[PDB]
């Protein structure tokens, strides 16, 4: 197929690009390098099945771009990703995550795109639900502008599906980690620990360390994107996680084990959600998707990546 | 109370201003005149409890405005309201209805505002619901960009409620009609029909006239805004309607009967985004708020016709 990936210069985006190319697709990458990195895509310099477009989804002529490249599927991973930044500037977050998505859908419905695969946020859209692991049927209850914008994006895409029959599905990842993750933000805690411990710099667990997340390896997430790109799961969100809860403290230990040396983090005052754990049954039933990579193994893979960057 | 009403130059907005003033409140109106009119407010030139601010919610310094006026409640009625334009330009619609709401909430949480009363869209947010009349517990399933932005608005306000304790409630009216409604607008059919038939000009329905809406008089809607402004219904939406369905065709007949003359609308192609049926369950507003609509359609239609006769 012809694929276009927004946020292609990013962690998950560049990984998806690699997978799509490996599957024999042509891939157009799109990014404004808000948080992305040229080094994430540099290996594709002489790959003729890949084309890169520098564009800001907020202001670029997405109509002209999609008219030119005629993607069959648009994989939408471009977003303002930082929860804290979304609180400091909800307008900016909403412009990128809501307006950006709307502009893309409006362009795609006019240019013969079959499907948009949106990226939601499994870790934040549910707020604090009464069910863990959390199924997609649980009500959204966003507690940050970031989370609200992700929900709004889902809803707008569902709307375009009604209006025009532009298909859509929402990939809602838990806590994604792995090679290429930027050691920054509360998202990149695996990267932060790996880089710091490898350096022998201090590491900080914010709170008593009991807070839990659902850690899913980037390759598993990418495979979900590929699966859902088909004519399946229309207008549906898919939780993409492992359905296992790992405490902040336990995560440190897993990274410490991989790195070697001391497992002795600093404990800081609490900064946020106490638990996150996704029910991944729908993805199995509908897409045949299961995560392949368990935490200890994934962390070793991730630490291996950071070893060579250090 | 110190109130601020966005969309104050508009149809429902100017009516709400009047009601709040009558109840003895201090009122700041705010509007950019996108679809509103200075003439909707001109009777307030010498009203000493009202001040007007010309401002765009998308671009103005709302922080500064709220900092000055310190409203306790913000009644948020400013919006792009045309479904057809929302289809033609979903970006602009989202800018006014989502970004505008976000900017207001961000300003409000910093300026000691107690509560924002949002205006959702009872008519459109449910899309095609599982049952009629439709309760608030029915899932949202917007089928136009306009409807999507309203849903998105509710969600962001709920979020700010969680984040900051900036209280909110969502008034979700059905088909609002009455004096001051734009007679050249999109779907304000009472106003469109009243003005046109009074003038002996053509009238149109979009589709085969069978589509139903739930027609609720502006004065009743405004009452709901006032009730909900207190410490009640935090985080909740309230359907504001009558729970009675009137077809486009029946609506036209009602107006023509009041006006006199022919009852013969043109049938045009249906509009992208329009729903077949709309009818709100208003049980929650009745129990929680004590709200009930007083004005029946025939009565309201007469009140509207007379407004357009003399204007
Ligand atoms: N990493 C996680 O744990 C996680 C989990 C759930 C959701 N997500 C979502 O996955 C997607 C990918 O995030 P990531 O972890 O790879 O982070 P990332 O920052 O590496 O990727 C986001 C990319 O989007 C680009 N981008 C941002 N604003 C843009 C704009 N206006 N125009 C064009 N490109 C723009 C950035 O430059 C960057 O390359 C995002 O939508 C994010 O919200 C990530
Ligand atoms: N009339 C109905 O049947 C109905 C039904 C349900 C919901 N609503 C909602 O009720 C509210 C009032 O609508 P109405 O029927 O009075 O229509 P209206 O057009 O008369 O009122 C909307 C007002 O908002 C103002 N406005 C628009 N964009 C603005 C911006 N960027 N900055 C500042 N002001 C801006 C307009 O100039 C206008 O005065 C809207 O939120 C609408 O979506 C109306």
**Residue-wise DSSP of A74-86:** EEE------HHHH
- Are A227 and A188 within one domain? no
DSSP alpha helix (H) spans, B23-99: 62-69, 83-88, 90-94
Resolution in A: 2.0
User: Could you tell me the two tokens for A308?
Assistant: 């060579």
Chain A: give the shortest CA distance to residue B140, in Å.
9
Ligand 2 nearest-atom number relative to CA B100: 31
Among residues B157, B295, B153, B180, which one has the least CA distance to residue B233? B157
- Are A96 and A31 within one domain? yes
CB B240 within 8 A of CB B171: yes
- Are B105 and B186 within one domain? no
- Residue with the two structure tokens 């008593």: A208
Longest dimension (CA), chain B: 57
Q: Which residues pair with B119 in a beta bridge?
A: B171
| Domain C-terminal end among B241, B260, B289 | B241
CB B189 within 8 A of CB B159: no
- Are A170 and A209 within one domain? no
Residue A87: list chain B partners with CB under 8 A. Answer: 163
Structural domain range at position B84? 1-177+214-241
Whether residue A121 is annotated as binding a ligand: the answer is yes
CB B161 within 8 A of CB B168: yes
CB A191 within 8 A of CB A306: yes
Q: Which stretches of chain A sit within 8 Å of chain B by CB?
A: 87, 90-91, 94-95, 98-99, 102-103, 105-106, 127, 140-145, 147-148, 151-152, 155-156, 158-159, 162-163
Q: Which residues pair with B268 in a beta bridge?
A: B206
Residue B147: list chain A partners with CB under 8 A. Answer: 159
| Domain C-terminal end among A241, A259, A292 | A241
**Cα radius of gyration (chain B):** 18
CB contact under 8 A, A90 and B99: no
User: Could you tell me the two tokens for A112?
Assistant: 């013969």
For A143, which of B90, B148, B163 is closest by C-beta distance? B163
- Are B166 and B17 within one domain? yes
**For residue A216, what is the DSSP state?**
E
- Residue with the two structure tokens 């399933």: B141
Give CA separation, B265 vs A287, B81, B209, B214, in Å: 50, 24, 9, 20
Mutate to test the pocket of ligand 2, among B57, B77, B95 (most ligand atoms within 8 A of CB): B77
Chain B: give the shortest CA distance to residue A18, in Å.
32
CB contact under 8 A, A158 and B147: no
Mutate to test the pocket of ligand 1, among A14, A36, A37, A120 (most ligand atoms within 8 A of CB): A36
Total Cβ atoms within 10 A of residue A147: 27
User: Could you tell me the two tokens for A9?
Assistant: 């210069």
- Are B201 and B110 within one domain? no
- Are A132 and A263 within one domain? no
Measure CA B158 to chain center.
19
Ligand 2 centroid to Cα of residue B101, in Å, is 13
**∠ at Cα A56 (A52, A62), nearest 5°?**
75
Cis amide linkage into residue A133, ω under 30° from 0: yes
Among residues B29, B42, B109, B33, which one has the least CA distance to residue B69? B29
Interface test mutation site (partner B, options A87, A98, A139, max chain B beta carbons within 10 A)? A98
Among residues B73, B144, B279, B309, which one has the least CA distance to residue A155? B144
- Residue A205 — φ and ψ, nearest 5°? -100, 120
Whether residue A190 is annotated as binding a ligand: the answer is yes
User: Could you tell me the two tokens for A189?
Assistant: 């805690």
- Are B98 and B222 within one domain? yes
Determine the angle formed by the axes of helices A189-199 and A295-309, rounding to 10 degrees: 50
- Are A32 and A64 within one domain? yes
- Are A163 and A24 within one domain? yes
For B99, which of A91, A105, A143 is closest by C-beta distance? A91
- Residue with the two structure tokens 């009818």: B279
- Are A111 and A197 within one domain? no
CB B28 within 8 A of CB B71: yes
| Domain C-terminal end among B200, B222, B241 | B241
Residue B103: list chain A partners with CB under 8 A. Answer: 91
Q: Which residue's C-alpha comes closest to atom 2 of ligand 1? A: A176
Give me the number of domains chain B comprises.
2
**Rounded distance between C-alpha atoms, residue B3 and residue B9, angstroms:** 15
**Which burial class, exposed, middle or buried, applies to B311 when counting CB atoms under 10 A from its CB (0-12, 13-18, 19+)?**
exposed
- Are B184 and B172 within one domain? no
Mutate to test the pocket of ligand 2, among B9, B55, B78, B220 (most ligand atoms within 8 A of CB): B78
Interface test mutation site (partner B, options A109, A129, A152, max chain B beta carbons within 10 A)? A152
Determine the angle formed by the axes of helices A295-309 and A248-259, rounding to 10 degrees: 60
H or E element in which residue A213 lies: strand A212-213
Residue length of chain A: 310
Q: Which residues pair with B176 in a beta bridge?
A: B216
User: Could you tell me the two tokens for A300?
Assistant: 């070793």
For A142, which of B148, B159, B273 is closest by C-beta distance? B159
Which residue ranges have their beta carbon within 6 Å of ligand 1? A 6-7, 9-13, 31-36, 56-58, 77-81, 96, 100, 119, 121, 123, 173, 175-176, 182, 187
Q: Which residue's C-alpha comes closest to atom 35 of ligand 1? A: A78
Among residues B161, B178, B179, B177, which one has the least CA distance to residue B169? B161
Give CA separation, B131 vs A15, A154, B138, B274, in Å: 45, 24, 8, 17
Whether residue A216 is annotated as binding a ligand: the answer is no
**Rounded distance between C-alpha atoms, residue A26 and residue A24, angstroms:** 7
Give CA separation, A64 vs A61, A69, A115, A306, in Å: 5, 9, 18, 39
């Amino acid at each position: 197929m012809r694929a276009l990936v927004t946020g292609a210069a990013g962690f998950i985006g560049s990984t998806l690009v690699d997978r799509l190319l490996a599957d024999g697709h042509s891939v157009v990458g799109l990014d404004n390098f808000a948080t992305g990195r040229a080094t994430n895509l540099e290996h594709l310099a002489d790959n003729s099945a890949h084309v890169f477009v520098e564009a800001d989804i907020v202001t670029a002529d997405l109509h002209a771009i999609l008219e030119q490249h005629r993607p069959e599927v648009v994989f939408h991973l471009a977003a303002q990703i930082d929860v804290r930044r979304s609180v400091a500037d909800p307008q900016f977050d909403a412009a990128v995550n809501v307006i950006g998505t709307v502009r893309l859908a409006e362009a795609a419905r006019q240019t013969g795109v079959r499907k948009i695969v949106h990226t939601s946020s499994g870790g934040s859209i549910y707020g604090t639900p009464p069910e863990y692991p959390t199924p997609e049927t649980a009500p959204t209850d966003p507690a940050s502008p970031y989370a609200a914008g992700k929900v709004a994006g889902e809803i707008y895409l569902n709307t375009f599906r009604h209006l025009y029959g532009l298909d859509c599905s929402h990939i809602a990842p838990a806590n994604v980690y792995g090679p290429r993750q930027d050691p920054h933000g509360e998202a990149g805690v695996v990267a932060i620990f790996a880089q710091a411990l490898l350096s022998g710099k201090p590491t900080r667990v914010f709170g008593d360390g009991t807070n839990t997340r659902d850690y899913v390896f980037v390759d598993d997430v990418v495979d979900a994107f590929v699966r859902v790109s088909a004519d399946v799961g229309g207008g549906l969100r898919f939780n993409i996680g492992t359905g296992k809860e790992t405490s902040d403290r336990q995560l440190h230990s897993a990274v410490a084990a991989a790195v070697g040396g001391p497992d002795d983090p600093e404990f800081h005052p609490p900064r946020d959600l106490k638990r996150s754990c996704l029910d991944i049954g729908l993805a199995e039933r509908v897409l045949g998707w299961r995560p392949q990579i368990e935490l200890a193994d994934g962390v070793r893979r991730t630490v291996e990546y950071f070893r060579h960057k250090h």
